[PDB]
Design a binder for this molecule. Structure first.
Ligand SMILES: Nc1ncnc2c1ncn2[C@@H]1O[C@H](COP(=O)(O)OP(=O)(O)CP(=O)(O)O)[C@@H](O)[C@H]1O
Ligand SMILES: Nc1ncnc2c1ncn2[C@@H]1O[C@H](COP(=O)(O)OP(=O)(O)CP(=O)(O)O)[C@@H](O)[C@H]1O
Ligand SMILES: [Mg+2]
Ligand SMILES: [Mg+2]
Ligand SMILES: [Zn+2]
Length: 205
């Protein structure tokens, strides 16, 4: 489902962005589904996702360009609110769109303020015609309501006790047990709605 909320959790170099770049993005593009990437990581030239769409420099670009990448310099509440409004208008034009947010702790941080945009993103995304892919490094980086509102939660290896406790409490105790034994680039997929778990082999490319 293009309007699903998907959350990816994995340590640095776990393979979560690789999953976005070589599974999610290709599948979206294959089904002719548009996306907007909120990118926080600068590279030597450009940003991490520069190759994956039009590098926007105005709000107008966000609405008009079918595949769009937004480098987020301010990384604040005001920016996400503006991006969300522009994403909704983008969705009006291009139909159901996935908003991809790497390093999502900038906008959905544990104990941060829930703006109107955040509340809408997590509760009214389908009506807004927007799916979400949210990515973070530790489970406890984000507001627990993100996991309660997700449709799919993807997790790579961890045995960190606070992480396991969060997973047990807000996601699934079965997930908390199974995440401990994942090998490199293997991942667990928890379906929040069916309460089902599948272990996935590393993706090819
Ligand atoms: N399924 C897979 N098969 C082979 N190699 C993989 C893989 N998934 C990830 N890798 C390798 O691991 C490296 C790091 O992957 P990735 O960038 O997805 O993790 P990450 O997003 O957590 C790092 P960062 O914290 O910088 O964002 C990639 O350069 C890739 O070469
Ligand atoms: N999820 C994971 N990510 C990265 N490295 C891992 C991993 N799980 C195991 N490894 C590494 O793979 C090596 C051999 O592991 P194993 O013997 O289980 O096969 C060990 O060095 C281990 O640290
Ligand atoms: Mg990454
Ligand atoms: Mg130890
Ligand atoms: Zn951002």
């Amino acid at each position: 489902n293009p309007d699903d909320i998907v959350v990816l959790v994995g340590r640095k170099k776990s393979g979560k962005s690789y999953l976005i770049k070589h599974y999610f993005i290709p599948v979206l593009k294959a089904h002719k589904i548009s996306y907007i990437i909120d990118d926080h990581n600068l590279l030597r030239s450009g940003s991490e996702y520069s190759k994956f769409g039009y590098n926007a420099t105005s709000l107008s670009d966000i609405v008009s360009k079918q595949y769009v990448v937004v480098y987020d310099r301010a990384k604040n509440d005001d920016f996400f609110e503006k991006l969300w409004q522009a994403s909704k208008l983008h969705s009006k034009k291009y139909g159901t769109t996935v908003l991809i947010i790497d390093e999502a702790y900038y906008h959905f941080k544990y104990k941060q303020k829930v703006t109107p945009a955040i509340d809408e993103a997590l509760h009214a995304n389908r009506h807004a015609g927007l799916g979400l892919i949210l990515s973070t490094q530790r489970v406890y980086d984000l507001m627990p309501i993100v996991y309660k509102q997700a449709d799919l939660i993807i997790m790579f290896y961890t045995r960190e006790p606070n992480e396991l406790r969060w997973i047990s409490k807000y996601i699934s105790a079965e997930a908390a047990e199974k995440v401990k034994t994942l090998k490199q680039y293997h991942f667990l997929i928890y379906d929040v709605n069916s309460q089902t778990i599948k272990i996935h082999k590393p993706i090819l490319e």
